[PDB]
Structures are given as structure tokens and as C-alpha cells.
Amino acid sequence: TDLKFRVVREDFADAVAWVARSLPTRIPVLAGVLLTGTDEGLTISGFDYEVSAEVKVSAEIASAGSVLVSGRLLSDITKALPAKPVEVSVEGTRVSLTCGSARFSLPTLAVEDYPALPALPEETGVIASDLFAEAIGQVAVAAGRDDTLPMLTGIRVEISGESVVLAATDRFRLAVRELTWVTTAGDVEAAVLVPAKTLAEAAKAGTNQVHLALGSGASVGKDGLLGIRSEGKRSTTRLLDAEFPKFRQLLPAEHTAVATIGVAELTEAIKRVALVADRGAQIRMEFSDDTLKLSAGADDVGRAEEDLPVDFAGEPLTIAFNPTYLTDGLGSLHSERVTFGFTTPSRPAVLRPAGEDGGSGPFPAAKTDYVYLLMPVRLP
Amino acid sequence: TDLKFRVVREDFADAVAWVARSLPTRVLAGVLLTGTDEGLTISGFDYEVSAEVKVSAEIASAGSVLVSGRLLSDITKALPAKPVEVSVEGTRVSLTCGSARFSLPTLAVEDYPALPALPEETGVIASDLFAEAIGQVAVAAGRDDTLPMLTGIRVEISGESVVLAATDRFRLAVRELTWVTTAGDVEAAVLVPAKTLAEAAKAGNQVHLALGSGASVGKDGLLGIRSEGKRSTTRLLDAEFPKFRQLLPAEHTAVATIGVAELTEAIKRVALVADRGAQIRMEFSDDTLKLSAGADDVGRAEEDLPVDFAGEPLTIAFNPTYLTDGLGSLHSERVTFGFTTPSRPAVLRPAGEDDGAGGSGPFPAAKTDYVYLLMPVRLP
Amino acid sequence: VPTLPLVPXG
Amino acid sequence: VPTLPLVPXG
Ligand code: NA
């Protein structure tokens, strides 16, 4: 039966855009978008064996059916349609799309090799969408981006009943975000690894609570799939089958020096001094008294140094960092102040968000939901 | 004697960014800071383009110094909202502004060419007019150095009348305007590098153009441009511009008038399916314009638009980008097209309030201050 | 893709 | 450019 429907332009264009996000760059049928008109409305879906996205939109179905059409072209067309209802009609091998005085005739793709969407696993728990986007955004910045070390390209998701912990690392920084969710099924104790680029994109797209589907019982993760369910939206992501490194042991129990300072002021001053850093390699940080002196430079390009007042306890310390790793971390705190936890110039520094608010030390590690652990670079 | 001055940071960064805008890609890298009686002079040069700006500055010690252009610009952009002290020592230049401190190496001033003197002033034009008219014709200039004569904007002066023209062999843009002559009526023509001039014009007081006076016009081989505190020069092209005037049709066998925004949006919509964006088809007949593009392998598109049309039905095709370039350079609510055959140039001009209708024609060409002449492509 | 009848130039 | 003391990983 030939599909035929009318739909509101904004509803259609949004949904198609959303699906076309997780659509592959280039088997050519996989970049197709599937339109199915049902008794309830229009389903718009895309799948590429790794990631699937399905959205349900209101529509006036004059004639039920389905059709596969090129995903990119459909997205481009729908973004540029005028302020008029959209009417879609399949007639033979063509799909016709009319909107006001505009008429598009597109070839239909072949279904005979178009794979059915995977079923989502059973529900595991529910997170408010704004929290989910923040946490995922925070840890994703530390994820590795090199497919030759696949374990690093995932976000580690560990579940302990009502507690969820997200972690990511690329060997130079480690991001760890703890949060609370409401479990839906039974109380659950498992860990899973999810492709970070995918998961960060889904979270960043937005939702208005997010239902995560990893399964339940002791069978959590057995489908090898992360399902994400939202109002009118369903998506799946293939889990990563790779052992994640043991990161928790890297979080120091105490520090020999700590430092507290405004995020915005530090970030601005870093960027300013780093302008003269050779190939953006390193920025130097000297802590002493109530002063932090940043410095950077190169032989043939020039030198820079800048002073900032700081809340600093412990013995004077000079430690160096990759400026970008550093501002990446600062930028992901989402707080006014940052607290640095140090030991030596050769050992990881702890960045935690501070709130509005002594002695010689050593200093107990603060308890926070979020931490960014940054490896220093060697001073020349 | 070593240069040392305090300067307002906004004024300084603005000046540097203007000079650095006209800076060579790869010793001429540096910009020249010079402290005088009146204040601080900032300049750059690359044998082709010169740019010099004067800014107020508490000079504390006279001198001058050559410092890296891109670096000085980046640093000055990043400075805090505090005054900037600059001081020269040895082969280093120091720059402090509040808490931040910079030390750049100086470059060898010995080999740095002096800025050429600007020619005698020829005329004066309002800034907004100058920016509009250059912007309007620059869109048609050639961008390929194998045909140097096409990479210029032709500037023909006859008394108070200035004609601007540019072409890339596919479209031709001509803009007439009137200015004030400062040294008696002159009759000459020069060819100025399009890209340079368009950048100068894109950068509100008044614009004084200097090419010399009397019969010595263009003899310096330089275009001087002066506004308050700003001086710049551009080497002229000694390439021979083709005769363009004879290309403007005296009459048309068909004329069409339509809204610019409505047509531009419909073109960009329809051309979404066009192969390589090679062409869009325009069918005029009766009271309707039908645009169409694409083929049945990727997809077809068409769209009808109400048009004010006179003459026999006509189907003509264009490069859609060349077409929207022309439409977007008209700056009027409506466009009037003047046609002859499908394989001869089409005139695009701002519609007047008379434009719209009836008659079989032929139709005499309108007198307008602006015209964009576009070569069609052949229909298949 | 003809050119404008520029002389010379086409 | 030392790495984090991840075990394994460095
Ligand atoms: Na005709």
C-alpha cells in the first residue's frame, strides 16, 4: 500500500533532523530514512547496525505504508521548506513532497536490504534530562578519540542500585561524575562501556526525562545495547566490549597542597599566557603565598607571565600542564570556583568544583560528585 | 633611543587589527610601531598594500620598533580592560597591561621598506556609498590569477561621475555613482585589485580616494585611500580591461519583475537537488515563473511563483549561485530581468516603481545606476 | 557554459 | 608527556 500523509513542517523537519544526526557518513541504503505511516501517526527511523534512532510524530495519514528515502537529501529539503503544511505521497518508485508552491520528486530506496530496528532492552532507570546532559557532557570531554585504543573511546557506566557513576579517560585526563537516578526495575549492580561520541551526541541533542534501557536482573548488558527512551523517541547504541582500566585507584585520598581560585579568571589568564606557548605545548603554574604565577614561552616567539591572587595552602609548588587539557577541565566544572589538589610536579592534579567559602597539611580529598584528574607535563 | 608609551588598549588593539588585516602571509610579517609628537603611528606593508593608522598615546620616549604582526594582534586582542604600557629594551619589546606581562623579540628594522607616499587626492565619496558600490561590483570580479585583467575592479572617472565595473567572463557588474572632485574634473581609468579594494571598503566619516590630479592620474601606479587617522595604498593593475559597455543591451524581447527575497529563497530551495549546482531552469509564461532543477537519479524539484511578465514565453537557465549573487547585490525589494534569447546575456536591475507591466515590446532598457549582467547556461 | 561576449574574453 | 598511572595504560 502507498504511503500518503500531511504533516506540520516544523514537526517533520525537527524529527528528520534528529534521526539524520545518527545517520552514517556513507552500504548506501543505510543512509536512508524510513517513513512509516500507521494508525497512530508517522514513524521516522534510521539505523546503521551500530546506532538506531526512531521518532514518532503526529501526522494525518491518508494512506498507511512505508517508504525509504535518502536521509541527507530529505533533511536538506525539510529545513528549507516554506511555512506551509507538508504533503508526502508515494507514487510508484517516486516519493512526492509538496509544500506550498514547492514540489519535490525523489527516488525511493530499496527496502529488501533495509534492516529492522533492534528492540530496546528492558528499562533500567530514569534520569532527569538536564542532569543527564550535564553529566554526560562533563565526562565526555576526557574520552579518547583514537579507534586504535577502543577501550578509551567509551564512557564507562557503572550502576549500583540508585547510584550511577560515569567515567572517561584518554590517558592524560580522567573525568568521573557520580549521580543519583531512580531505578525502574529491580535493584541493579553492573557496569557497561558506551561509545562516547554517540552518547554525548544523544545527550546534547536533548529530550523530558530520559529512560535508560540496559536490561534487568543479572542480564543487564546481555543485549549488548544501550537503549535511550524519551517522549516519542527511541534510540539504541551498540555497547563497547572492551575492558576499561581501573581508574578509581588514581583518585588521591589526600593532597600536600590545595589551591582555590575563580574559574573564569583562571581560564581567561591561561588563554592569554598560552598565546606564546610553542605549539601550545605547556603552561607553567607557580604557587606561592597568596599568588599564582602563570608562565609560557618559546625561544623565537616570546614569553608571557601573569599573576593571580589565589587561596593556597601547602608548600610552594611549580607544576606544568597542557593549556588545552587544563581549560577543558576548568570548562567542565560548571561552578564559580575551582579547587586544585596537588602532590608533586610529576603526579596527577585533581580539579573539583568548589563552592562559596587552612594549615600545613596534608589535606583530605574533598567529596564531590564531579572530578577532573589531569596529568602534568615535564618541566624542561 | 628606545620607544616607550602608554596607550588605551581598545584604541591600540583596534589599530593593530586594522593594520594586521592587510598583512602578507610569509620580515614583512611585522608591524611597525612609531612614537612621535602627535602620538603613535602603527603601520604595515608588503610592497603591494600599505596601511598606516595614527592613534592617541602618551608617548614617554620616542622611537620605533618592528614586532611580529600576527602575534602582536593576538596578544592585543586578549588584553584585559586596563591601559597598555609598551617599552623597548635591547632586542626585546615588553608589553604590560594590568597583571599580564609579555616580552617579544624585535625584528630587524634595517630591511623594512618605508611606506610609499599616497598620490595627490582626486575625489571624496561617502563611506557607506563607497562600501555599497564596491561590495556590489566585487561579487563579479575574477578570482583567478592566470587572467589578471579580470581580478580587478575597473574605476573610470569622468568629472564628478565614477563608473565601477568587474567581470569574470560569466557575470558583469557595473555601478555608476557621483562624488566630489577635489582637484578639478579629470578623465581617466584605472584597474584596482578586487580583493584588496573590497576588503578596504568592508572596513563612517568619509573616504578620500587618491590617484593624482590633472594628466598624472595612475602614474604613481598606486591607489591611495584616506579617512580620519587611516592611510593606505594599493598597487594598480596594468592589465588591459575588456570593453564592457557594448555588452549592455539597448532593448529586451521580454522583461520580468519579481520580489528579490521571494525569488532568492525559491531558487535556493529548488537548487537543492541540482547536479553539482550546475543549473536552475526558469520558465516564464503568462503570469507565472516556474523554477526547476535536478534529475531522476538524485531528485527533481520545481516551484511556481507569481511574476510580472511581458513578452513571449521564455525558458532560460542559469548557474544558481551566479544568479543569487546578482540578486543579493541589487539591494532593492524587487528585480527586473531583461531578456533576449535563452543563450544571450540577461540583465538584472533594481526594479523601479513603474516596473511590472503591459505590451508585446520590444522593451527599451532602463537607465539604472546598477546593473548585473548574467550569461545563461545552455539547456540540455 | 558559454561566456559573455566580451572582446576579447568571451 | 607522561600519562596517568592507569593500570594498564600509562
Ligand atoms: Na520570449
Side-chain angles (χ1 to χ4, degrees), chain A residues 97 117 139 195 259 266:
Chain A
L97 189 146
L117 267 33
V139 298
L266 216 204

Side-chain angles (χ1 to χ4, degrees), chain A residues 29 32 40 88 116 169 209 338 351:
Chain A
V29 173
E40 291 181 345
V88 171
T169 181
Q209 63 187 353
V338 54
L351 290 69

Side-chain angles (χ1 to χ4, degrees), chain B residues 116-119 121-136:
Chain B
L118 280 73
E121 181 162 321
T122 310
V124 179
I125 188 201
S127 317
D128 47 23
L129 174 52
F130 185 65
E132 187 185 348
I134 300 287
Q136 273 184 318

Side-chain angles (χ1 to χ4, degrees), chain A residues 73 76-77 80-82 94 101-107 268 272 275-276 299-307, chain B residues 71 74-75 78-80 92 99-105 265 269 272-273 295-304:
Chain A
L73 185 53
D76 293 336
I77 294 178
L81 291 180
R94 316 286 301 188
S101 306
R103 301 181 124 272
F104 291 92
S105 175
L106 314 191
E268 177 188 316
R272 180 160 45 233
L275 289 171
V276 292
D299 317 325
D300 270 39
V301 99
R303 298 172 304 266
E305 51 173 318
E306 176 164 355
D307 297 316
Chain B
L71 187 56
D74 296 340
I75 287 167
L79 293 174
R92 317 293 312 197
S99 299
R101 263 156 288 117
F102 291 83
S103 177
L104 315 190
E265 168 186 339
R269 224 196 323 275
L272 281 189
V273 304
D296 302 78
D297 30 312
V298 165
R300 291 171 282 107
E302 51 182 85
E303 186 168 351
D304 300 318

